[PDB]
Structure 1
Amino acid sequence: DFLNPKYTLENFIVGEGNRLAYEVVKEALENLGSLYNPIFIYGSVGTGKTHLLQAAGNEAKKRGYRVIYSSADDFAQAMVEHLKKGTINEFRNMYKSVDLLLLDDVQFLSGKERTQIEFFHIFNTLYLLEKQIILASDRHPQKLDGVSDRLVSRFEGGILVEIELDNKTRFKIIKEKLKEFNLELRKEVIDYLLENTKNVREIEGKIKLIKLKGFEGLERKERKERDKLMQIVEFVANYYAVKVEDILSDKRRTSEARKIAMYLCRKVCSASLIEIARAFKDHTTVIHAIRSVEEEKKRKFKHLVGFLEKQAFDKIC
């Protein structure tokens, strides 16, 4: 065993944002490997990829099939010990004799050459034998730099499903979770969890705190420090005429105010990148958006920043 039984088909919630992946996994777990076999699942972190996979193999062991789950960076670490302890073949045949192959976090294949090569062989091998293979990554095939070309066209030749947690999809997931716990559904809670959670981990992370220290316990820790970061409705809106709602959406000098707001949050307010990125969720934007500020600290600028730096101190310190 390396599958946890607490993940299952029913158990997983379905909305138009992970419906297709759900049904590919379910619709295929019937004729195992003989329906449509190379299934690649990909989605943002905490999109439920791991669930979906753990949940497939669980159904297989229950139905009696011979099954392996493994993260790609643990497949590597095994192959690397078996290689050392001169047992690379009982390793291979272990994998070649699965009714279902569940390879998780495929993205960790980059750079590992022989460590890839190895999988390529069990792949074709299980494929040719019409066994069932389910891959899963954080990124689409195309984006796998540092993974051999012959594997990527391999991945694309099957079924690519994306898991894109939209809004209506988060609607359902929050709603169903609150029901799961036996908390009561109410617009206030559902709407907060809507405008404050992007992945399922975040949701359920928060739905447990709700199950633990009420809801009026959330909006203090969660919102208060990020009300100190209402520095947008604060100052940069009032300086060079900016409307809050437009600055919270990347959209052409209207968008030179942003680069300042994020900066003031870092240096004066001491907030973390992640803390700051939750005013915009791609955490590199902030970093070079804050550097370009002093990358352009070279004509009638230096004193403008300082005047505002002194302005936030008075207000907040």
Structure 2
Amino acid sequence: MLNPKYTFDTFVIGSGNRFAHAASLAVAEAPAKAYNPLFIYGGVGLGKTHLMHAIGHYVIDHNPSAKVVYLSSEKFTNEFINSIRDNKAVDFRNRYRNVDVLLIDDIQFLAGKEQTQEEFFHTFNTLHEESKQIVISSDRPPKEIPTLEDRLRSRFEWGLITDITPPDLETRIAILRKKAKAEGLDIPNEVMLYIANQIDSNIRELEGALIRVVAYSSLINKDINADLAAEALKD
């Protein structure tokens, strides 16, 4: 279930993510003991899911008996709605109310879902009173999620809330050198600089702009440089 590229070690710290990283490690090192719940929000492609998976690995790599479960809220909704239609709701509860860490991603996808919101509420309360770790990610802070009840907003606000903001030029370059290290790549700093300057959006667009430049250098079998990089990225 846990993408194995998404560790603390592959996660680059910058000003924009420092809080969320420190909170995520606090929680990993001391599950249910440090911050419960941890609520992480922020814009598209900024590492929410990466951090959530990093908390996961850390906890498992340190307690092989720990029942650790990641899933988007869309998947939590689908399994729940199913258990009602198939009358096996008792089996959905024995699953999700007895995990040791619950990592639930993108809770904004519960908007306009009266029933799944309620079931998430009862799941949240059970896990909290049983000293289990809850980690929720969102694209926006609890106040800005519509159709949400006070009682549920109130529990999202009860632990630590951290935001993630987009990285600067320097941080984008550090994210580029980190993926390049991961595949043994010798790349000039003028290239990274050039790439990071064009792509100031999400680390996916960024990750992708690098994959291209390299793959192209490989096809034409020529050394990587800002002349090549710019050619590979016109389109």
TM-score > 0.5 by shorter chain: yes
Structure 1 residue 217 displacement after superposition? 4.8
Partner Cα separation in structure 2 for residue 149 and residue 77 of structure 1: 24
Partner Cα separation in structure 2 for residue 163 and residue 169 of structure 1: 13
Instruction: In structure 2, give the amino acid aligned to 1:219.
Output: A
Structure 1 runs (4+) deviating above 6 angstroms are none
Partner Cα separation in structure 2 for residue 144 and residue 31 of structure 1: 29
The answer on whether the counterparts of 2:111 and 2:145 sit within 8 Å (CA) in structure 1 is yes
Which of 160, 175, 188 aligns to 2:190? It is 188
Structure 1 residue 12 displacement after superposition? 1.7
Higher relative contact order (CA 8 A, sep 6+): 2
Structure 1 residue 222 displacement after superposition? 3.2
Partner Cα separation in structure 2 for residue 200 and residue 43 of structure 1: 13
Structure 1 residue 180 displacement after superposition? 2.8
Instruction: In structure 2, give the amino acid aligned to 1:123.
Output: F
Count of residue correspondences: 223
The answer on whether the counterparts of 2:142 and 2:156 sit within 8 Å (CA) in structure 1 is yes
Deviations 1:34-92 (A, max 9, x none): 22111111111111111111121122222221111110011001101111110111111
Q: 2:206 matched to which residue of 1?
A: 203
Unaligned stretches of 5+ residues in structure 1: 226-317
Partner Cα separation in structure 2 for residue 183 and residue 30 of structure 1: 32
Partner Cα separation in structure 1 for residue 15 and residue 180 of structure 2: 19
Structure 1 residue 178 displacement after superposition? 2.9
User: In the alignment, does 2:2 pair up with 1:3?
Assistant: yes
Deviations 1:177-232 (A, max 9, x none): 33333333434312222222221111111221122113545423634x6xxxxxxx
Deviations 1:19-41 (A, max 9, x none): 22111111121221022111111
Q: 2:221 matched to which residue of 1?
A: none
Partner Cα separation in structure 1 for residue 84 and residue 58 of structure 2: 32
The answer on whether the counterparts of 1:179 and 1:185 sit within 8 Å (CA) in structure 2 is no
User: What is the TM-score normalised by the length of structure 2?
Assistant: 0.87
The answer on whether the counterparts of 1:34 and 1:131 sit within 8 Å (CA) in structure 2 is no
Q: 1:74 matched to which residue of 2?
A: 75
Instruction: In structure 2, give the amino acid aligned to 1:191.
Output: L
Q: 1:212 matched to which residue of 2?
A: 215
Structure 1 residue matching 2:16: 3-state secondary structure = coil
Q: 1:105 matched to which residue of 2?
A: 106
Instruction: In structure 2, give the amino acid aligned to 1:58.
Output: H
The answer on whether the counterparts of 2:39 and 2:136 sit within 8 Å (CA) in structure 1 is yes
Alignment of 1:150-299 (within 5 A): 150-167=151-168, 168-197=170-199, 198-214=201-217, 216-220=227-231, 222-223=233-234
Aligned-residue Cα RMSD (Å) equals 1.8
Partner Cα separation in structure 2 for residue 203 and residue 67 of structure 1: 30
Instruction: In structure 2, give the amino acid aligned to 1:37.
Output: N
Percentage of matched positions with identical amino acids: 40
Alignment of 1:58-73 (within 5 A): 58-62=57-61, 63-64=63-64, 65-73=66-74
Partner Cα separation in structure 1 for residue 148 and residue 71 of structure 2: 18
User: In the alignment, does 2:13 pair up with 1:45?
Assistant: no
Structure 1 residue matching 2:104: 3-state secondary structure = strand
Unaligned stretches of 5+ residues in structure 2: 218-223
User: In the alignment, does 2:141 pair up with 1:140?
Assistant: yes
Instruction: In structure 2, give the amino acid aligned to 1:96.
Output: R
Structure 2 residue matching 1:212: 3-state secondary structure = helix
User: What is the TM-score normalised by the length of structure 1?
Assistant: 0.66
Structure 1 residue 152 displacement after superposition? 1.5
Partner Cα separation in structure 1 for residue 114 and residue 31 of structure 2: 29
Structure 2 residue matching 1:195: 3-state secondary structure = helix
Structure 1 residue 176 displacement after superposition? 2.3
